[PDB]
Design a protein around this ligand. Structure first.
Ligand SMILES: [Fe+3]
Ligand SMILES: [Fe+3]
Ligand SMILES: [Zn+2]
Ligand SMILES: [Zn+2]
Lengths: 141, 137
């Protein structure tokens, strides 16, 4: 059983890092695209595919071990549970996280960032609603 | 400049969350694919694109606000700096992180997971080497 072990925690941290790596490399690739470095952009994109394989591998061990979603601490064994995890995360983001981030940004004098956080808050609310509709489809039959 | 502000930290946390969301939704989509729910799989994939836009937006503000890479705490203003950040992260992973994870996995009685971490350790080393070769240019 992996529950409660350090390995369980390391699988979680491993997933976080790999997720960030893929986003970072694809972001970097756009800069290489812009400047005319197709070889470098291509490498970034290919290595990014590697980080995807790594992240999914971590999730397989987590799922197969009965561990929870690194992002929501919710089970992800079944498709229904996966959707429920998506809903939980999106709900936290639009009801508390992004609104809180936006408030702090305004308070610190960064209205541009605040507006970005507010845009995202509304976006995650829409995502949550979309996922809830999917859950009703699955559980409804 | 955003240095030293709470907003700086929030941008970092937002980036991490959005990064995880994209990986999670694409992973979930594979299950929907397998079970025969193309519309649900498609929606997950489309929402995942939304999370990509969010993550990149966070990085834009981080880069423009004079902040560092959420994963390595290194500057990412120029392409050169971006590659250097990739190298730093990969180096941390193959020299310390994954080997350490593997040792602990073996000690706790998880040889299969340990082998996985060892596979990744070798992979990250290879990644670091490829990036370093690109650093000249
Ligand atoms: Fe990796
Ligand atoms: Fe998002
Ligand atoms: Zn979302
Ligand atoms: Zn790598």
């Amino acid at each position: 059983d992996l529950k409660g072990t350090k390995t369980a925690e390391n699988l979680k941290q491993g997933f976080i890092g790999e997720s960030m790596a893929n986003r970072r490399y694809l972001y970097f690739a756009k800069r290489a695209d812009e400047e005319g470095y197709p070889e470098i952009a291509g490498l970034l994109r290919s290595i990014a595919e590697g980080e995807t394989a790594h992240a999914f591998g971590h999730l397989d061990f987590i799922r197969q071990g009965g561990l929870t979603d690194p992002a929501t601490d919710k089970p992800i064994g079944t498709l229904e549970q996966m959707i429920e995890s998506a809903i939980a995360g999106e709900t936290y983001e639009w009801t508390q996280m992004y609104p809180g981030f936006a408030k702090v940004a305004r308070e610190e004098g960064f209205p541009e960032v605040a507006e970005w956080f507010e845009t995202l808050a509304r976006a995650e609310k829409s995502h949550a609603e979309k996922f809830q509709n999917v859950l009703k489809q699955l559980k409804g039959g």
